[model samples]
Target chain A: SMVMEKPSPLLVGREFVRQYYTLLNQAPDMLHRFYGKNSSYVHGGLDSNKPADAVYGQKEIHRKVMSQNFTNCHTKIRHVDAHATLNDGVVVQVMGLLSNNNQALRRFMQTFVLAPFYVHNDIFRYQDEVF
Target chain B: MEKPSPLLVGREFVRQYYTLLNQAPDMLHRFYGKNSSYVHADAVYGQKEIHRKVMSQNFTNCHTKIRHVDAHATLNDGVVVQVMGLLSNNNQALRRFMQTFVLAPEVANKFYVHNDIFRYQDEVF
Candidate 1:
């Protein structure tokens, strides 16, 4: 008959260490930014793992990105929509551009590097607790 | 000359406000992220003025900043492509859409709303 020995006491501790690190490593890409706030992990990156997959079996899309200068123009349009909302007359211009074409926004968002994005509050997770 | 006039001071203040907000270093922290630590005045003060103007003037401005998610897949052809989804704030979901895009909210000059205009066309200008 074969006899089996119980596992060592240290085995549990080893497993614990492995689990702790695995959990940390397995932390989602979103959480990685907690470690490096401005890191590319926040923006995400093109996966080289999918290099072949990315280049092939694909379609190309395009659109127009319309913007205007805010200088040497009408006074009313100056502050009409100022305060970091692109340029002064951009809204009016965009509206006019999309006037005859309702599909303008959609069409633009489809292909270009132009798409609506979000603004985050900038407060880090576990920040207060960690600090 | 004599002492500066109050009118000159008032005019200068307005100029400074607009100039500061519209400059690079002012918005540098938000723009470049790393290597720059100076926070924009907007970040310090919040969007009170900007949002107030947006609301008061009834001025609707539409702009876009793109986010890309790579779900790499290939068609039967040899050419490769990236599958991307665009997030628009002009809708009901935007009120709490932060969870999907990022871990938590960070200070951002972001899209507050996105909507389709049904009534008037040719009224952008």
Candidate 2:
């Protein structure tokens, strides 16, 4: 087994993506743990002129998540393209197939800005997201 | 639509970014600095190489219509912007694309793009 001490942007980005799905799918209530107070999430297609109903804060975001049945949603991410940002931060762009409640598979694009609270300990939380 | 203070900055930044990108792409390097990076169709780092690759591209007559712009503050007083939209060249084709920008604070109110990732996701069959 190759044990690498430091995690690269790509490494941490992909891991975060996996951990995100794992939490959202199985433990939707705990989604708050992965985000900070300044964090935000936007849903639906971007083209719509609807108000910028961006959910803010971990509590509000968890409320937003629990309002919907996330277990009915399953995502198969095709790409986890991540780039390094300031202070060990990560900018990850994810695109892939999504199937909700056995509906026809459709493509989705999501972006996350992950800032590390502790780099050595690898504590990263979502600062922003668009889906 | 009401926007948060950080999001207000994000909106203007993206607006100017695409405007410069569509009108004068060679100047796009201004958004990035020495510690900056852009990636995912292919990756490039720093302003000099970013200038080389961006100015070298033949994205002539490029025009982009942003579908959505989402931004929020990061742990470090920085801001992140997520943009998804369609790009067209001379009205030739409308292609779907997603772009992410991380803006690091330069002053109390100003920020410079620190990391960028752009991808083309046209269609899936």
Candidate 3:
């Protein structure tokens, strides 16, 4: 018997990644709409002297992310993978190359935990990790 | 009312996790979530895939140690930890290791690793 299947979490996560980067490049200010008020952001990389601090709250997070003016920064999505968790949460694996001044800077990978939230007629999800 | 601190629990998890990795890497599979994803130089899904990959890793005759760790509890029900360490093979070859872990709470107040990513600071592994 042919069975009906639910939509794949992977595909849903991929679309979110697409929209996220698009908005990140096009409009960094509007990107805060996707995050919850107390969501956390973590980042780590080659700059060993720089500490990877976990910043919380939407306002603080937005400030920290846009501090460097990434309006012209572009990222290429190499992979968008998903894992279904026990508590109705899905962890998205986003891998890509970050480029600026027409040069690839680093190969970055980030994991975002999409927790479901609702606001009136729209559905929103918040991210937890970016390191 | 106050909830128990995740920072203490997170510190303990890192200790035990490294112990298992250095002593019996195979047993470390129990720490992973049922549907977790681990990405290092490659990407793998599920515990079985993680097991196979760890088993074949380049830990042979090497001693792994962690230092300069910074762990914090996320606003959500999880922990975010970053560590800088080294893996030495008989002191002949040394590789610096930098890793980040996002751990989620599971049943019975226990936490399982939901996502793990690793990279080298100045070297490629």
Candidate 4:
């Protein structure tokens, strides 16, 4: 059997995804701290006839965040499957479930690409999609 | 008639999806986008191509019994469902399955799955 030590980037990437959704549900407006200035979020599962345009930049992305309309929103995330790529890029697949406004439970699987920020002290989400 | 709850609708869709995979696989194409893609051990693109791959599979006797399911309505008027379950053959253990489906709204406010990706725990089937 082949055994290899788990990579550190994978560890960090998983934690980043967990924290990202936690903060997303709680403080959607303040994600600029973790998301890259050049990051983009594409809405998947659109009609094939339409283009999958992405929301770019942290400021604009924050503006489009869902309002706190849900009376009580709960997010459960786990089973983080991470894959590493070149240039410190890691694609993490997250299996998550959300209960918004105490409504019916919604399940989601999202992929996030994380990379080190130019500022050196933080990592930023460069690309995000719910597949 | 009152519109069905997205939760009910989504669950029924997923149930039907697995049923088709085990029975009438040809009807599964209508659930996917025209340019949909499936990524598993290999990547297959296009609705027709994905349908071909699905029909060619040997899940004739395999039934996916969903253990836990969470369904959420998206802001785009679509539904995203996460499922964790077991696939068995005649009540015998087969494999544990984890899957995600992104269903988008189509004409007449109907929902069609645009993306469907799945993986097994620690092994391939």
Candidate 5:
């Protein structure tokens, strides 16, 4: 036996105490205010006609606040699966429809739809916690 | 028989019922898929790690390519709506996952976890 020594009963309590202190140091308010009402947006509201703005709002939501999860509401249309895609097939489809080069639709989906989500996630961060 | 007055029956029906149904979610439930209910993120793809897929500093791949999935209030009125979505494909072997994957969300696991019957009724297969 390298060394036999019974641990004190207070060890688990001490660990919990240490964890509590650490979380408190970081952001105790999260747990402290757990049940309290928060103005911060978590649930979504009725969609305005301006889907473009709605898209932007979601971008901001995911970027600033810690959403941990998110997805576009546009897929809510007909098929939950239908959505804009980046793959070459969709590219060909768009170009075939427009009679324009493949680059046109590529640029459209990339610039308008996908890029904003990336941009928002990159540039924004929540600065305040509202009650 | 009686000459069948077909004045604007089709047109008017489309203008009224079709348009109205599109606006009303419950009417559109059949468009999603049968037995379409919101499912747990992990349960969908034998994925125990939902957060791991979110953009993060520790690891990036974020699991599946599809981005978001969610379940909402049952019907247009939110007062009454059928539960939707079905297990078209399930992967289970100590761990399980979605198999067929008919629809893929753009964002991954961003939507709230729950099954809605009204929203996922349209899938034909």
Candidate 6:
């Protein structure tokens, strides 16, 4: 049994960080489930000079990311900060450390604005990243 | 310039913001309003408080080199700008930083920093 009140962004951000990276680091192919039709995801590379590409739509997002392999390298999350926004949405910031097949440690950060009703287990899936 | 699209405005805002942050930190408070919220290492309140914090940032010899920025229309006719950049001190080694700003309109082309978040972290990864 549960109440119908709104949840804090702290809880949402923490849980989102876990499931998001778990799928990204282990089951990246299935990570597309986190996105919706209007979603836009941009990923910046490890290089400072290199630019990050914005991948739009869940369908192509799946296609574009499915090609990369993250099965071996695991991601470690360091911090999560969340704030509530209009319409019960959450603005979350994530920071973490990761490694590659080259065994070099890489640091990363991403900001996401997540909300909307998808399903019981996936209600807070990312909507637009809002920015 | 004429009325610009949200994307162009977002980019231009980021350019002007970081430049002001790095140069005339004193004048940076004009971008924010009384209701604006700012989170640097910690959440700050009130325009005067935000202005005081801005004055102490010690960006006199520092610069921010923007790498990528994205903007999208949001609820209430506002614009959200997400930026990734390198923060350098005295033109030396640099560390990556990320910032997000939610802008609410003031007049036709003018806007205020309704909400802001800044942190020292790697750009998108």
Candidate No. with top lDDT: 2
lDDT tens digits, residues B50-109, model 3?
A: 888878775545576765555555535676555556767545666665566767786666
TM-score rank order: 2, 6, 3, 4, 1, 5
Q: Model 2, range A1-131, lDDT digits (tens) per residue?
A: 78767777788889888887777667878877776666776544233544336676777767876765666667777777887777777778787776656676667677777775321111111112232
Q: What is the interface RMSD of candidate 5, in Å?
A: 16.6
Clashing pairs in 3: none
Deviating ranges (above 4 Å) for candidate 2: A1-5, A45-52, A117-131, B1-4, B123-125
In model 5, the runs with Cα more than 4 Å from the true position are A1-59, A62-64, A67-80, A83-131, B1-125
Tens-digit lDDT track for model 6 on A1-131?
87797777779878877887776767788888877765666654423543445566788777766745555667676767776543456667666666645476656656776763221111111111211
lDDT of 1 by residue, A10-126 (tens): 343233223422433343222222222111111111244521111111011000001111122111111011011111100001111111122221111000010011111111111
Model 4 lDDT vs. the true structure? 0.57
Docking class of 6: incorrect
In model 4, what is the error at residue B93, expressed in angstroms?
Answer: 1.7
What is the CAPRI rating of model 1's predicted complex?
Answer: incorrect
lDDT of 4 at A91: 43
**Rank by lDDT (best first):** 2, 6, 3, 4, 5, 1
**C-alpha RMSD of each candidate structure in angstroms:** 26.2, 5.2, 6.5, 12.7, 23.9, 6.1
Off by over 4 Å in 1: A1-131, B1-46, B58-122
Residues B53-124, candidate 6: write the lDDT tens digits.
877666667788776677765545566677767889767788777677877787577888877888876433
Compared with the true structure, what per-residue lDDT tens digits does model 2 show for residues B1-125? 33247779889999999899888989998888888887746788889998888877677888988877767776577787777788887667888777778888764477888888887775332
Error of 1 at A115 (Å): 11
Question: How many Å off is the CA of B113 in candidate 5?
Answer: 29
lDDT of 5 by residue, A5-54 (tens): 64332343233333423443344333222111111112222235411112
TM-score winner between 4 and 5, please give it.
Answer: 4
* Tens digits of lDDT, candidate 4, A1-131: 89997667558767786676676667766655655555555433233663234455666555544433433557676456554322445444565566667776565545455553221112111111221
The TM-score obtained for chain B by all candidates, in the order given, is 0.21, 0.88, 0.83, 0.83, 0.18, 0.89
| Native contact fraction per model | 0.05, 0.45, 0.00, 0.00, 0.00, 0.11
Supply the TM-score for candidate 6.
0.75
Q: What is the DockQ of each candidate?
A: 0.04, 0.42, 0.18, 0.04, 0.02, 0.19
A6, model 3: CA deviation in Å?
Answer: 2.8
| Cα lDDT for residue B100, candidate 1 | 10
